[PDB]
Amino acid sequence: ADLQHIKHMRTAVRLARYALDHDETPVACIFVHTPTGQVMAYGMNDTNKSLTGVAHAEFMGIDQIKAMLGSRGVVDVFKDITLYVTVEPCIMCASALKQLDIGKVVFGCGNERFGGNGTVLSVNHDTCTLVPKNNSAAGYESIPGILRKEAIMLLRYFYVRQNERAPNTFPPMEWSKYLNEEAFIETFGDDYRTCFANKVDLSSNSVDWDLIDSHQDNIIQELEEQCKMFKFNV
Amino acid sequence: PLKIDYQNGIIENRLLQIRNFKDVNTPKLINVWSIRIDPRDSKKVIELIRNDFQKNDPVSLRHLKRIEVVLCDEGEINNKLKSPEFAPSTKELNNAWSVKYWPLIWNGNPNDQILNDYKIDMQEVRNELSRASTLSVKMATAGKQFPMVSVFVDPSRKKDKVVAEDGRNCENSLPIDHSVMVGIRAVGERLREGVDEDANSYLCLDYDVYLTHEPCSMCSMALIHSRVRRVVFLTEMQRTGSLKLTSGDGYCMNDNKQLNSTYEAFQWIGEEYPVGQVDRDVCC
Ligand SMILES: [Zn+2]
Ligand SMILES: [Zn+2]
Numbered sequence: 001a002d003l004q005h006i007k008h009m010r011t012a013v014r015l016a017r018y019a020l021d022h023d024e025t026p027v028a029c030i031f032v033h034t035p036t037g038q039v040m041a042y043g044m045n046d047t048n049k050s051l052t053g054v055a056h057a058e059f060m061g062i063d064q065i066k067a068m069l070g071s072r073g074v075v076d077v078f079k080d081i082t083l084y085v086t087v088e089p090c091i092m093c094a095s096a097l098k099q100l101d102i103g104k105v106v107f108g109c110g111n112e113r114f115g116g117n118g119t120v121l122s123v124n125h126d127t128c129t130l131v132p133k134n135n136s137a138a139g140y141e142s143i144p145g146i147l148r149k150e151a152i153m154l155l156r157y158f159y160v161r162q163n164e165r166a167p168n169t170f171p172p173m174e175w176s177k178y179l180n181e182e183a184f185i186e187t188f189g190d191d192y193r194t195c196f197a198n199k200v201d202l203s204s205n206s207v208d209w210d211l212i213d214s215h216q217d218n219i220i221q222e223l224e225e226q227c228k229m230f231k232f233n234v
Numbered sequence: 235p236l237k238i239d240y241q242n243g244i245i246e247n248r249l250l251q252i253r254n255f256k257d258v259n260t261p262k263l264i265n266v267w268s269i270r271i272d273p274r275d276s277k278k279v280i281e282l283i284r285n286d287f288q289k290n291d292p293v294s295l296r297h298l299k300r301i302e303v304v305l306c307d308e309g310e311i312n313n314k315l316k317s318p319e320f321a322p323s324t325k326e327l328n329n330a331w332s333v334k335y336w337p338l339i340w341n342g343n344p345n346d347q348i349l350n351d352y353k354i355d356m357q358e359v360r361n362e363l364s365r366a367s368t369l370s371v372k373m374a375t376a377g378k379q380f381p382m383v384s385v386f387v388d389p390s391r392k393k394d395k396v397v398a399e400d401g402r403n404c405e406n407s408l409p410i411d412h413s414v415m416v417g418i419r420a421v422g423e424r425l426r427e428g429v430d431e432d433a434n435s436y437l438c439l440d441y442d443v444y445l446t447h448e449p450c451s452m453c454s455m456a457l458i459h460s461r462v463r464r465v466v467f468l469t470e471m472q473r474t475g476s477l478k479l480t481s482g483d484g485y486c487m488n489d490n491k492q493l494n495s496t497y498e499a500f501q502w503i504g505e506e507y508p509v510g511q512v513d514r515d516v517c518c
Binding site for chain 1: 410476490515
């Protein structure tokens with residue numbers, strides 16, 4: 001419930017919306033350099049172009065950083081990065097992010113079938129997925145539920161849209177999969193704290209319709225300018 | 235055809251079946267989409283719900299003693315105008331689940347039917363494994379610090395097998411450039427080029443994959459997304475492996491009911507095909 005988190009997730013949601021409108025799954029990434037508050041890379045699902053089942057948002061953003069900074073660059077900077085994703089990283093992405101030693105993940109809605117930050121596995125706090133520098137597994141935090149409703153709604157749009165081819169009620173939020181009540185209240189306010197962790201319900205009260213219903217065709221050009229600014233600040 | 239040791243899940247003294255036992259104890263339920271009738275209707279409905287409801291349902295409900303009957307709204311009542319997602323492993327578990335949720339048909343350990351249905355070409359397996367291993371030792375002999383190999387065979391066996399060395403040996407590499415990932419990207423780029431791929435090529439669907447080393451959590455899940463049929467590996471990685479029950483945190487990613495998808499997995503437990511020593515902390 002930090003406001004930088006709202007800000008950056010809003011960006012992620014705009015990008016996911018763009019993904020929806022280009023016939024792709026609305027999972028989208030914003031890699032933020034936490035010490036400066038700067039947007040350093042972005043991602044969208046890209047399995048339509050790649051024809052592989054591995055070209056996920058996070059992967060796209062890892063490539064962008066590798067291109068901007070080189071391999072050494074990626075490995076060096078990554079511990080300083082806060083990732084913002086609309087949907088919880090899948091096990092595969094959660095594991096890649098673990099191995100690269102990411103600072104932190106903030107996500108919207110859980111990933112019901114493949115979620116590797118608590119929903120199906122907790123790769124981010126496991127013991128078999130290591131940081132190679134020192135073969136460690138201290139882990140990373142993954143903050144759930146930031147614009148959860150928005151992420152869920154974008155997915156519903158996708159499911160409906162997907163069917164167009166040639167021939168509110170949001171689920172209970174099992175928060176205890178992603179943090180302990182103490183870790184909840186350190187993460188969120190004490191008012192929202194008690195009530196929300198307790199009743200298995202979402203932090204918010206109305207769906208931001210303008211954000212998810214309006215198109216974002218300029219989003220790429222916006223993120224490009226912002227990314228190149230970060231590059232000139234390096 | 236094949237010698238099966240049903241006791242231990244070892245095929246031909248060499249292929250050790252890899253799957254999960256902890257999770258086979260608990261039941262993963264569904265709701266009862268029931269139907270109530272009297273016996274005369276029963277025989278007519280069981281015909282209708284037999285041919286379509288078994289032939290068409292994406293779930294496999296053949297372990298359910300369907301007699302107080304459930305086919306599996308529009309297509310359902312149109313045809314009806316005429317008038318444990320998974321089996322348990324023990325008889326005890328069968329009887330208890332029978333009364334807890336629904337009568338089930340007990341037909342022995344369902345893993346016995348799985349081992350029997352495994353269609354395996356023993357010589358192909360040996361071949362690919364010999365190939366990956368010989369490369370592995372070459373790589374090690376060459377000083378390469380990540381002497382791991384993945385070999386991707388397509389369903390038809392007519393395309394060129396894709397041979398993928400670990401990327402962390404290469405110049406501009408990331409810690410996540412593991413051999414399974416590389417081979418997956420290679421198959422993808424082969425589809426993208428389109429010279430040797432039909433319009434019914436999709437992902438690595440029904441590919442078999444041969445690894446010198448048990449894959450990490452990223453790679454395991456990566457093969458789930460790529461919809462491969464089978465993985466066969468040589469070296470277990472207790473610290474990092476994500477297939478064997480006793481490797482890693484027991485992810486058993488090939489055989490996790492919570493995902494919608496599985497693949498068959500085997501370890502080779504003979505000594506014929508030695509590989510390059512890898513540090514045990516290495517993911518992959
Ligand atoms: Zn993913
Ligand atoms: Zn791996």
